[PDB]
């Protein structure tokens, strides 16, 4: 997983937010992108270096009318969690990086996500798509030769417990059941 | 160019919580 597309029609008719991670940095742009139906980043195994390397982008066919650009540090049994909000013009990203010993399900227990970046984007978002790095071998013309979880936020009241170091260590969802209430 | 590639639930438990703001708080229960 390298990034995400956030927008509405996800074509050159409207502005869309493109977030992509790579080896050295994160590039976040807002443009009238003409996105592919199956947008992805190509990756191949370099036979001499014996490692995976970037090839070409197949995310969009064209981009223009760019209004925003931001570049920062990279962040994409290793659980990576993100929260995406779009409030009052700010596209807010929260994140956490936690080591896990699970294969199928998300881990149990509590860990709060911290603010990553507050982006002054100011656009309408109704749909999004995940950008994946696809191995070169999958692009063969034959019929033979990337898991993630998505949830949605709701307007809820939470009781958050801050410990002595100001870390949230537990929380109660006040609408979960009569005891939480 | 573009390539035409197109050819389950889990329990969220108690995860997905984030710091609601940028205010430091300690040893306190905040609603």
């Amino acid at each position, epitope marked *: 997983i390298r990034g995400w597309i956030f927008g509405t029609t996800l074509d050159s008719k409207t502005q869309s937010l493109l977030i992509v991670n790579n080896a050295t940095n994160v590039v976040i742009k807002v443009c009238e992108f003409q996105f592919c139906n199956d947008p992805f980043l190509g990756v191949y195994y370099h036979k001499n270096n014996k490692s995976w390397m970037e090839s*070409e982008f197949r995310v969009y066919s064209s981009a223009n009318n760019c209004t925003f650009e931001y570049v920062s540090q990279p962040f994409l049994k290793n659980l990576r969690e993100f929260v995406f909000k779009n409030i009052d013009g700010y596209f807010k990203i929260y994140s956490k990086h936690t080591p896990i010993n699970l294969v199928r399900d998300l881990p149990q227990g509590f860990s709060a996500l911290e603010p990553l970046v507050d982006l002054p984007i100011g656009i309408n978002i109704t749909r999004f798509q995940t950008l994946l790095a696809l191995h070169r071998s999958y692009l*063969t013309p034959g019929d033979s030769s990337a898991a993630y979880y998505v949830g949605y936020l709701q307007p809820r009241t939470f009781l958050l417990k801050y410990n002595e170091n100001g870390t949230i260590t537990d929380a109660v969802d006040c609408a979960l059941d009569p005891l939480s209430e | 160019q573009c390539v035409n590639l197109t050819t389950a639930y889990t329990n969220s438990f108690t995860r997905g919580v984030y710091y609601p703001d940028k205010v430091f708080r300690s040893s306190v229960l905040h609603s």
Partner: antibody
Amino acid sequence: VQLVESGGGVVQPGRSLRLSCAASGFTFSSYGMHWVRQAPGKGLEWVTVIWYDGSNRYYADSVKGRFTISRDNSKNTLYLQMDSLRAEDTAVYYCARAVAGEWYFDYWGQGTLVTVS
Amino acid sequence: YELTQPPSVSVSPGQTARITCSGDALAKHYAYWYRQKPGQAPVLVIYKDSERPSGIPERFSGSSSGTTVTLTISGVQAEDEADYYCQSADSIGSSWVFGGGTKLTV
């Protein structure tokens, strides 16, 4: 596995010619197909590829916008439609099967000669 | 993604022929070698730089270093007098490339 080309002939520049490659001995619908051409006295030049389900197709720059590749998986037949042919397109056209899971061509047909003059 | 190989190699029968092919792409991806005789379609001899098909004898082998790949043919006979090609593909799988072709004279 057998690949049989047909439809080759002699045409004038600007005219169209359609080639056909009949496939047998394998599950045609599971394999991607290529066309490769070789002008007399010249080496092998890749022309075009079509994916097993026809979802994707790519062309060499030299034929891009002129050639169209298509396939009918119900007839086990590969087609190549060459429009606006030029003298430079004189070559023996081979159909070849893409190897599953790799980037080389394992099975080849016999080839059919197309002359433009 | 161009492939460069010499126009010809001259080898006496019983000797070892070394047909090379070079290009930046060959430091990244695998090379494939074909043997074509007059009047016949190209036949795969080596794949993944060094591996043989079951129809190809042990006299054929391959190796690579940097941007150069080599097809080695030991005990060359009259039957090996053919045009050999190096083949590869780009990083996105949208284009296939052949080298000019090397005529091996026995």
